[PDB]
Symmetry: D4
Subunit: 162 residues, 8 copies
C-alpha cells in the first residue's frame, strides 16, 4: 500500500515536487501523488486530510509556493506527520514559501525542508527514513543509497579536469 | 446589523486587533469580534467562512502572526471581501506574517494592511470606506474623522517644545 | 458606468497591470485604465483622486514599482477604497514596492495585493468582490468563475504525464 | 525506553528547548536530553549520531542558534530522522539559525520547525506524531491534547474583557 | 533668511529629526522646522513644495517612517534639492522607510541618509555642505566642526579605562 | 569649468554610471568622469578628494557595488557634497551596495540614490538641482526637462495598444 | 612585541571589541588596541596601515558598525592580514556592518567574523591560530584552551536543573 | 610542500572555487584541491581535519553553498586557520551560505570572504598574505601583484570609449 502521499498546490509545482517522487522510485516506495490546493480546492483538502489515516498514509509531503497554506492546513486536520516543501516563487525566490510553511504556531507542526528541488528530494528521503524505522528492507535500501552517494564523492576527490 | 467581522488566530492577537475595533467604535459601526484559528479550529473557520454572507458580513478583517493561514483560508471559502492584518511576530517582527498573508496566488485575494497596530486600525478604516460607498451616514462620519486628523496636524505645525 | 479604475505609475507597469484588466474583461466589468504618476504627474494625481467619487469610482486599483507613492497618495486624497499592486522591481524584486505600499501609517489605508501579476489579477478580483456585495449579477459571475477554477484543479488531480 | 532524544548546541539553548521537553512530559513520552555541540564536542557528536539507532532512538530533535551545524551533522551520520529547531539568535533573530538548518542539500534531510520556543514544542509534537504511527496509546494522548487545544479556543470566542 | 527647511510626517518623528536641527544650531544655520504629512496633510504638502523656492529654501530635509511618501512627493513638486531621512520604524526597523525613500524612479531624486538619528544629523551636515559651497563663513564653521570631531578621536586613541 | 565629477570603483560600473553622464549631456552640464577605487587606488582617492575643492567641484557623484567604500572615503576627505550610487551587485542585487553607502555614521554624510541605473541618473539630476540653485540657466533647463517628462506621460494616458 | 593590533571605528565599539582583547589576555598574547576611524581619522588610518608591517603586526583585527569602511580601507593599504568584526548596529542589527565588511571585491580581502561579541572573540582566536602556526607555545596554549572549552561541555551533558 | 588546501562541499562548487586556485597559480603557491563534504563524506572530513597539521597545511580554504557546514566542521577539528567561501546558492543567492559560515559561536572561528567568485579569489589572497608573513618571496610576489592591479586602474582613468 502507499504509506506516503505527495501533494502540491498547483500542477506548476510538479517541476519541483517531481524530485520527491524520483526518490521514491529509486527506493521502490509506493506513493500517491495529487494536486491539492488549500486556496482553490479547500473542501477537497479537508476531505483529503480527514481521510489520510484511514487511507493508510504515515507521512504526507506537501509543497507550495508563495503564501503556502497547504502544508499547514493539512497538518491542522490530521495526526499524520506533515513535511512541507517550499517551492521557489518568482518574486521572493521561495522566502515567502519558506516563512509561510515553517513559522507554524505551537500545536500544529510541519517539518520543513529546503527551498526548491533539493527540499522536495529531501522530504522524500526524510519520509523514507521515518518509514524505515519499521521497515527493515527500506532501511537497507536507504543505507545502500547513502553509501552510493558517499562513495561517488570519495572516488572523485579532484574536481579539476582530468 | 453587523456588516463587518473582526477575526484573529489567537486571543494574544487582541492587543493588536483591538485597534481595528477602536475605529469601529469611533465611527459607530456595528461589528462582530471573534477568535478563529485556521490551525486550531479549522472546522469552525470553514463554518464561519461558509456562513459569512448569510450572516450579513460585507467585509471580513482577519489578523494573524507568523505563518498566517487564517486570512487566506477564509478568503478561499467565501466571496465576502477579506482584509488581512499581519500581527507583529517576535522573531521575524511580522515579516513572516506579512508574506504569508499578502503573497496569495491568482484567484483568491486578501487585501493586506501594514504590520501591527497601524494595520489593524487601517483595515477597519478601509472596511469602513468600503461600507461608506453605500452608507451616506458612515461616509459622512469617515469624512469628519479624516478632517479631524488633518486639522490636528495643521494646527500643530511646530513639533518643538512651546 | 465604470465603477473601478486601474492606474499605474508608468506604461512599463502595463505588462503587470494588464492582468487586472484581464479579470474585468472575463467578468464583464466596465473599467477605466490610465497612467497616473505621483512622481511625474503629481498635479494630475491630485485632480484624479479628488474627482474619483464624482466620476463614479467605488474602487481604485493602483500599481507601482520601487518607492511606490501612487497608491498612498491617491488614498490620502479620496475616500474611495484604494487597492495597491506592488510591481516587481528589478533590483529588489518588488520588496521595495511591497513595503512602500503596505506600510501605511494609521489613518490612510491601502489594501495591498501580492507582488506582480498575481497581485494585479487579485486586486481586480477583490475589487470585483467588493462590487458584488451590491451587484447580484457580478456576484453570480464571480461565483461561476471560482467554480471553474476549482473544478479545473479537481478534474486534473494527477500532474504527471498521461 | 526513550525513543526520542533532544540535543542542543549549548546549555543556553535550554531556555528554548525546554518547551520540547515540556510536550513530552504532557504526553508521557520517555525522552533523553543532552548538550551536544558540533563545534565544541565534534567527536561526541559523531559517537552520539553513530550510536543513535542502537540506543533505540527513532527521532532526534536538535536545536542550535547562529550558524547551526548540529542538526545537519547528526543527520549526516545516522538514518534516524532528525528534526531541527532554530534557536532565536541575538543579532539575526534566528534567521541565520533557520537558514543554516533548513537549507540542506539533496541527500541529507532535516525537518525544520519554527524559530524559537514554538518550534521547540512543535518538534516534540511532530516527533510524537511520528511515534504515534505505531503507538496507539500515544496516538490517543495526542488526539486528546489536540482536542483540548481546540476546545479551549472554541469555548473562548470573545477575546474582549468580560 | 532660512535657506533650509526640516519637515517630517509626524510629531513623533521629532525625536529623530531633532538631531538635524541640533546640527544647524551648532553651525549657526537659520532653519525652518515643520510637520508636513503627505498622507494627512496632502494639500499642505503641495502648497509647501510649490512655494519652497519663493520662500528662499535651497535645501529641504524631509523625514518619515514606514511607507515614507513625504520626501518623494516634495521632490516631485519642486526643484529645491530634497534630502530624505528614514525614521526607524517599529516593525521593520527603518528598512521600509529606507526603501520607500531611496528607491525613487528616474526623474525625481531624493538624496537619502542613514536610518535614524545618525541620518538626521547627516542630512543637516550634507545640506550645510551644500550651502557652504557659496557661504565662506559656513564653510569655515563646517571645517572647524570636522576638525573638532577628528581631534577628539585623535586625542583619545585608547578606549580602555584609564 | 566642470562643477561636478562622476567617479566609480571600477570600469565595470560604467554600464550603470553612464546614465549619470547622460543626464549631464542632456542638460549641457560640464562634467568630469573617472575611475577611482578606494580599494585598488586608495592613494589616488585621497589625492582626488583633497584636491576636489581647488579643482572647482561643487558636487561629487560616486558609484560602487558590493562593499562600497568609495563614496564614504571621499566624503571623509572633503567638504564637497558627495552623492552615492549603489551599483547593482550580482549576489545581493545592490542591497550590500546600498547599505555600505547609506549607513554612514554621524559626521560624514553621503546623499544616496536608488540602486542601479535609475539612481545614477537621479544623482546627476540631484547634483544639477544643487547647481541650479545658483545657475539660472541650468535651473531653466532642468525645469524644461521636468516639463517634458511630465507632458510625455500626460499625452499618453492609455497604456493599452492603439 | 605586539604581533596583533585591535582597531575600531569608535570608542562605542569597545563594548564589543573588548571580547577580542579578552581572548589575548587569556592566551597571554601581546596586543595593541586603538580607535582608528576611516571616516573621522582617514589620514591616521592611512599612516596606521602603511606602518603596520614595520611596526611588527602580523594580523590586524578591525571592528566597525553600520557602513563599515575601516577594515577594508586598512586592507587596501597593507599586506598584513586583516580580520573584520561586524559590530551590531541599532537599526539593522549588524546586517549592514556584515555586508559592508565581507562583500569586498576581488583583490583586497578581509576575513570576516560573526556579528557582535562572538565575532570579536573569534577574530582574536583566528588571529591567534594564525600566529600559532609559527609559535609553538601559543599553539599549545590554544590547544589547552580548546580542550577546556570542550571538556566543560562534556562534563555538563544535562542542562536541566540538578 | 603545499601549505594551503582548497576544499569544497561539491564538484559543482568548482566553478566558484576555481578562482581561488587561479590566484595560487598566479602567485606560484603550491596548493591541494579536494572535494570534502560534511554532509556526504563526514568521516573523511574528520580525517582530513585531524591530519591537516601533520600534512603541513597552514591555511585551509573551504567553500560551500546553502546550509554550509564544511568550513565550520573543519575549524572545529583543527587549529589550522580556516577561511570560508560562501558559494552563491540558487534560491537565496548565497545569503544562506554566508550566514551558515560567518555566524560561528565563540570558540571556533572561520574567516569568511565575499559570496561567490570574488570571495574565492580573496580567500586565496588572504591565505597568501598569511603565508607571506613568513615567506619573503611570496610577500614580494603579492606586492607585485597588488601593484599591477593598482597600476591597471591608474593607467585607465577614463572608462568611456576611446
Ligand atoms: N500556495 C498555494 C496554494 C495553497 O496554499 O493552498 N495553492 C496554490 N499555491 C501556490 O500558488 C503558486 C502558483 O500557482 P499557479 O501557477 O497555479 O498560479 C504555486 O506555487 C502553488 O503552490
Ligand atoms: N497564524 C495563526 C493561526 C492561523 O493561521 O490559523 N492561528 C494562530 N496563529 C498565530 O499564532 C500566533 C501565536 O499564538 P499563540 O500566542 O496562541 O501561541 C498568533 O499571532 C496567532 O495569530
Ligand atoms: N513608483 C512610481 C511612481 C509613483 O510612485 O508615483 N511613478 C513611477 N513609479 C515606478 O517607476 C518604475 C519605473 O518606471 P519607468 O520604466 O517609467 O522608469 C515603475 O514601476 C513605476 O511604477
Ligand atoms: N550552532 C551552535 C553549535 C553547533 O552548530 O554545533 N554549537 C553551539 N551553537 C550555538 O551557539 C549559540 C551560543 O552559544 P553560547 O551561549 O554557549 O556561546 C547557541 O545558540 C548554540 O546553539
Ligand atoms: N510616512 C509618513 C507620512 C507620509 O509619507 O506622508 N506621514 C506620516 N508618516 C509616518 O508615520 C509614522 C507614524 O506616525 P504616527 O506616530 O503619527 O502614527 C511616522 O514615522 C511618520 O513619519
Ligand atoms: N566597492 C568597490 C570599490 C571601493 O569601494 O573602493 N572598488 C571597487 N568596488 C566595486 O567592485 C565591484 C566589482 O568590480 P570588478 O568588476 O572590477 O571586479 C564594482 O561594483 C566596483 O564598484
Ligand atoms: N563604520 C564606522 C567608521 C569607519 O568605517 O571608518 N567609523 C565609525 N564607524 C561606526 O560608527 C558607529 C557609531 O559610532 P558613534 O557611536 O561614534 O557615532 C560605530 O559602530 C563605529 O564603528
Ligand atoms: N553545504 C554543503 C555541504 C556541507 O556543508 O558539508 N556539502 C555540500 N554542500 C553544498 O550543496 C550545494 C549543492 O551541491 P550539489 O550540486 O552536489 O547537490 C553545494 O553548494 C555544496 O557546497
Amino acid at each position: 500500500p502507499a504509506r506516503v502521499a505527495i501533494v502540491m498546490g498547483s500542477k506548476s509545482d510538479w517541476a519541483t515536487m517531481q524530485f520527491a517522487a524520483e526518490i521514491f522510485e529509486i527506493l521502490n516506495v509506493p506513493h500517491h501523488v495529487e494536486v491539492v490546493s488549500a486556496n482553490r480546492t479547500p473542501d477537497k483538502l479537508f476531505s483529503f486530510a480527514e481521510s489520510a489515516e484511514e487511507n493508510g498514509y504515515q507521512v504526507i509531503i506537501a509543497g507550495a509556493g508563495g503564501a503556502a497554506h497547504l502544508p499547514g492546513m493539512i497538518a491542522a486536520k490530521t495526526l499524520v506527520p506533515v513535511l512541507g516543501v517550499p517551492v521557489q516563487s518568482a518574486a521572493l525566490s521561495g522566502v515567502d514559501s519558506l516563512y509561510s510553511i515553517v513559522q507554524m504556531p505551537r500545536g500544529i507542526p510541519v517539518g520543513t525542508l529546503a527551498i526548491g528541488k533539493a527540499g522536495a528530494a529531501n522530504a522524500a528521503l526524510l519520509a523514507a527514513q521515518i518509514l524505515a524505522t519499521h521497515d527493515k528492507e527500506l532501511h537497507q535500501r536507504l543505507n545502500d543509497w547513502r553509501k552510493a552517494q558517499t562513495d561517488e564523492v570519495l572516488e572523485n576527490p579532484d574536481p579539476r579536469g582530468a
